[PDB]
Amino acid sequence: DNLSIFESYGTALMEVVCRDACDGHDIGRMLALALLDRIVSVDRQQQWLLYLSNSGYLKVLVDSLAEDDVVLRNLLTPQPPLLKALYIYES
Amino acid sequence: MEELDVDPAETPIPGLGQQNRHIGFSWGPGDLLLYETLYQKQGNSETAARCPFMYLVRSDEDIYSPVLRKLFNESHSIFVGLQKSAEEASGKSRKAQLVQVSRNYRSVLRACMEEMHTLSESTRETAQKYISQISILSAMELSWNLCEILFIESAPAGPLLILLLEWVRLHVCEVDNIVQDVLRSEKPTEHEKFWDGVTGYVLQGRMNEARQLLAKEASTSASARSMCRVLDDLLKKMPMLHTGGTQTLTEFELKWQHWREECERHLQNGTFSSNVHMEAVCRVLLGDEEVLLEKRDLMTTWYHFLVSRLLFKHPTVKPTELHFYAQSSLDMFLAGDSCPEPLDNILLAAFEFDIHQVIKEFSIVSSNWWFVAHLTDLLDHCQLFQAHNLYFGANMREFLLLDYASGLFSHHSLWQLGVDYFDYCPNLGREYLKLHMERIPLSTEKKALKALRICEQRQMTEQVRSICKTMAMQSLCNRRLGSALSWSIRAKDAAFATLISDRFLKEYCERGNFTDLDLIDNLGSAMLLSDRLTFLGKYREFHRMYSQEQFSEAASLLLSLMTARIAPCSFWLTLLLDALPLLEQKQVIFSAEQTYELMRCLEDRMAAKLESTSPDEIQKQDSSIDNTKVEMLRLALARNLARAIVTEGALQE
Amino acid sequence: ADHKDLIHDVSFDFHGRRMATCSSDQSVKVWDKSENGNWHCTASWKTHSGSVWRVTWAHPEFGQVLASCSFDRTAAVWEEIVGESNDKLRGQSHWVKRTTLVDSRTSVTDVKFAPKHMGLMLATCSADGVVRIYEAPDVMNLSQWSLQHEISCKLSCSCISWNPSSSRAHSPMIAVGSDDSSPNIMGKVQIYEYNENTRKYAKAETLMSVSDPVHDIAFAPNLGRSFHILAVATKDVRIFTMKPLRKELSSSGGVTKFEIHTVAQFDNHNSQVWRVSWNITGTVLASSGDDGTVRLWKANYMDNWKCIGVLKGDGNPVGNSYQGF
Amino acid sequence: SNEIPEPLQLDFFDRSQIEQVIANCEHKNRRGQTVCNVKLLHRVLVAEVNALQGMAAIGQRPLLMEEINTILQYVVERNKLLQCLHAKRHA
Amino acid sequence: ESHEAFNEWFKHINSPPQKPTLVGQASFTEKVAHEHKEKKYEMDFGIWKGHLDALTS
Amino acid sequence: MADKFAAKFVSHKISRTRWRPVSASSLQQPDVFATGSWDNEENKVCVWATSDFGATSLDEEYQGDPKQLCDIKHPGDVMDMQFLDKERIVTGSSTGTVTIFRHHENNQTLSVNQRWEQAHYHVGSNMRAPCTAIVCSSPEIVSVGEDGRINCFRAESRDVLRTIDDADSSTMHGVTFLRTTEILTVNSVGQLKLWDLRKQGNDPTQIFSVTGERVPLHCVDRHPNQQHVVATGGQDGMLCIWDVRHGKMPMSLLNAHEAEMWEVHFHPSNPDHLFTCSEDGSLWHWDASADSEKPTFLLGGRSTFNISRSSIAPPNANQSLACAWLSTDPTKGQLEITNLLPSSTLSVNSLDVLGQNLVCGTDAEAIYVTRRLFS
């Protein structure tokens, strides 16, 4: 029922969640990424992933990976940031 | 002039130089003027037609051009469009819009350069100045494209060299000039500059026509078929930015290494030797400095030298070494017979980055405020840390817009972009516009309506009232009473209204002008602001009601007028006289108390009139006639009240 | 003659429409700018019995009233009265003296007008440190006035500066500057404020730092808001910036708390500057004096003033350039 | 329903002048918002409409008094809405 | 259709007639305003009478 | 007549009908206009007053039917006129009789001021030259004929100082403005001629056309503010709307409305509303006169319209148009088709809008007065 309601909604909520996850901060971005992970795990038709790949989000994913690499470099350097960065990298 | 010392007036000849001129200054609508004033020595001034010694002081005279103002209007229109679209979000869309507007700017700049070239071909004497302006515009476009491909994108190794080569081949026409000079000869393939043109095409990157020309040379010369075949087989290993999933520099480095290895193998085997032309071509392609300094007729300037070095020496470079390579290129280019240049230093600074210092150098050297404004807008669109102060105050874009608005108002036409440029500034723009629109003349109807529409779109009131008062006094000087009254009732002012009222009063006292049906046609607040129009309307209503016969309404209107007290004494006399036609009659039911209160009000009004005219005396020239009229009015009033008493006594029967 | 004797005063309109010239020719000349281009001689007539000294137009909220000053201890008021100006026709400009301003026994140094608000505050300064402000009691006639204010300072007079009021709780002040061709008197600039609690002018500020004679003072109006700029032409090039500090809640125009410091000091005349120009908000400054030297300065994107033109007028000219630019 | 408290809102003149007056009348007080005193705001409005005139001003005093009364009723209703919003925030 | 026309006519006749909108102690400007209001009221009354006659027919 | 918008049958040719600024640009509402009696027995200028709804400034009663407040008489003909001043009205004639009338606002009457029987003179007197379109501005009044004859009069004096009579081809109907030294004329085929203030001899200076669609141009008018803004309406639609006055051939092409447009009027108060009439009985209302950048009032027609504010963009990659130069695609937007009357009148001649009231004179000798309700 949840998947049918999501498909009936279409790409509005998908784009909203994607924008909130990309142009976010720390806790909100981590929670949005965890929600995306859970919805991908409970997915069954992969049409959501197909739309994500077709909408041109590859450059945004590359930028997110670069930001994660920058966070990893900051953690490797002395004086680590807050403890939430560990959970962010885990997610 | 603008930095040194100005020269005195008159000619340095003895006759006209025996008497010096202490030139004085004068100010007006922002345009300063110089007048011939005499001091110490004598002078030769007159008072006739035109101005002596053609004194027409005006600044920014070189910017006035038919195509220049059109290009500026188009640029500011697309600038306003960019500011309107800037309310979107951030990301790759902003960079795409920036690239699009930069391409549009380069296109309109190329169009302006073509128009300037056409004007140069049309003219004759100003050809040198037009060529100088064309070169300046080309340098401006080159700097704009360099800033767009360097600061905006800020791409690392890989596509940076390709973008630089594309910009060079798009902004450089020396290769085309060399190709034209080769084609001018009777034998292009047998020309000595054919190999130079081929090397230039290879440097630019266009390999299709390069390989075509190589095949043509192989078909022409009998001792170059296998040579050109080996050259084409070697050029096939060129790296055209491979995309095996993402931006990878390993493939580019491997392709460059394979190309170098194949070239070295051919040179060691001999298939690429034993020929002077191809040997020199290979020596140039290997990456030298003295050979390129000798063959500098092919390359353009320091940026061309730098891109040639980066293409023939390394596969790709990083931004950490790009500035070093550009500095070394400029250094050896200046060493190889050259001279320093301000535009070259500006380009070197742009390559060395630091946006703050490059825009500082731009504002110091070039006085073009629109270019700095566009650069600041692009830097703000790119989402970068910008300075919030103009090294003295605050906000550089506001200062640039104010400078452009001043430079535009210095002219005598086109003042529409200044309105929006002042609306964009929610600080000094309001007072600047309020001071400029009140300082500019508002005499002609065209500019008057223009300023009226401008202030109406800006939604103001003081400027509207000022323009209305100015046009009202203009109409009064030109003898336009109706126009002056319309302007006064538009500005909600009463000075001109009372002036026109007194004009009507003296006109009626002279000849007697009262046919004014404008109040009956249309009304508003003029009848409340003044009293002459109200008096005329009341008189017309009284006349119509007396024609339609209504003594009750006549008495009511008379009481209302006596309680309102309108118009001075010259018309108060007529208002008090207007009672006999309503008193000599005997018909119509009349009430005793109504007649009593009416006669009491009339007597009180006449007593107040006598007291207000003069203390216990009367003036004017109508004395005996006025007394006789008062006596006959009192007699008619007595007869009317007697008839009213008779009617009241007969009604109760 | 024909502008061949001693030049007195030349003035231009703020709208760029009319210009006036007066000298020792016992007559003034008023020229008008053509709508198609350039200008020509429009009219020339006698305004005073002696040598006309000064001439100043009026505010754009009234008309083109000419205030002709001379050494005859009087001041004439002229207005361009039209004749048969009806429909698409312009009548002949008939110069008719409406009224005159006379109440002193010395010559007039300067004259200016006032905006609407109350009426027409006409100021007239004499050659002994006494200014008089007259008000028009009626609006339908320009042949009457009443002396409403008199201010007697020290030394003599020269120029006067006001302030176009447009804001709230603000009154137009009057800035006066004494001069006597002797830089030995301490304090030369005074500022009087129109206190409304007494409905009269009262002392406010007195510049005790400047001691040189003040020939004129150029004021930068800002609608009675923000800051202000005052350019003084003494012996050098002095420009000060007056910044408002705070307003008290007890004095409605009495004592004020203003700060005035030197913000542009430039010495290049080495003589006695007599007149200084004024552009928009301080962009181009031309300073001239009684020594045959004109100094031009421009303000770029900073706040300094660099020498851009040194015009000679006492010796012999060496060339001819930049006469119409 | 949401109770949004508005300090000053005019609609009888130009919107530019209305926004300018609104931006000028922005200061803290005792209620907690950017509102002014019931008499001080009317005094400021009177001073503003007096400092921007010309020479003619007849028949405008009753209109100004009616506008002042309407603005007073408006700010009273907005203060009531502000108390409602404060009680809702406390709840 | 008959019920719709009946409801339209009923609401039209239940709508009270307009008023000239005038008060006592009126000056000249107040008299001009009252005259304008009476003119617009007469126009609205004529329009309403025409509409009511059409709906009744 | 007696219901809805006003409809009167004056039974006369509705030549030039223009609303006077007597009741406009003031506290009073516009209702007084003037009409020329061309193609009749006596060419007389009649000042009339309409009847609008409500009463905001002592308007007329009843439900319509305008009434003639005044009329003037002159032996000359009546072509057209441009309101240079509220009290001054200059009307040309096809027989060389320029009538400058003086209208008294304080009297609501017309007085014969000047009747130039020897108009269009410059090197003598007694000259007769026909006129087609006369337009005034500061400080010149320019009148054009059929064979390229141009006449120029000054606004500060009552005399003629420029009469250029050359030999041109085709027929020119109408004249716009540009500046004080440039004149743009349209042809009855699709040509645009650019002349200067000092032109001698035959052979026109610059002649341009529009590639693609070339229909006969009919009415042409200029903007009351910026002179370089031109509004043209011809056969199948072929106007060159431009916010400037440079370039060789016009790069603008706005082709719409297959029906012939006889007249296109502007809003005199707020020059941002254009009203266009059709030959099949249609009245279109366009907003934003090119220069005014504001949200358009519905699309319609092959035009580029105007741009407004844009916000809320996806984090992906968008675009922002491009750059191109072609004499086929439009460049400046203007036509904003608003469906008001599809097919109600059999024919429509001229129309004029002011403030909120629109008068419309039809070819069947009738006039219609409509109060606008949109914006």
Numbering used by the authors:
A (entry chain T): 1464 to 1554
B (entry chain J): 1 to 653
C (entry chain L): 9 to 333
D (entry chain T): 1190 to 1280
E (entry chain H): 746 to 802
F (entry chain K): 1 to 375
Study text:
Three scaffold rings, including an inner ring (IR), a cytoplasmic ring (CR) and a nuclear ring (NR), anchored onto the nuclear envelope (NE), provide bases for other functional parts, such as the cytoplasmic filament, nuclear basket, and permeability barrier. In both CR and NR, named the outer rings, the backbones in each subunit are formed by one or two Y-shaped complexes, also known as the Nup84 complex in fungi or the Nup107-160 complex in vertebrates.
For CR, the highest resolution reached 8 Å for the core region of the CR subunit with a local resolution reaching 7.2 Å, while for the whole CR subunit and CR Nup358 region, the resolution reached 8.7 Å and 8.9 Å, respectively. Strikingly, a total of 5 copies of Nup358 NTD could be well modeled into this region, suggesting that there should be at least 5 Nup358 proteins stably bound to the stem region of Y complexes in each CR subunit. It seems that the two Nup214 complexes help to stabilize the two short arm regions of Y complexes in the CR subunit and contribute to the head-to-tail fashion of adjacent CR subunits. This result showed that inner and outer Nup205 help to stabilize the formation of two Y complexes in a head-to-tail fashion in CR.
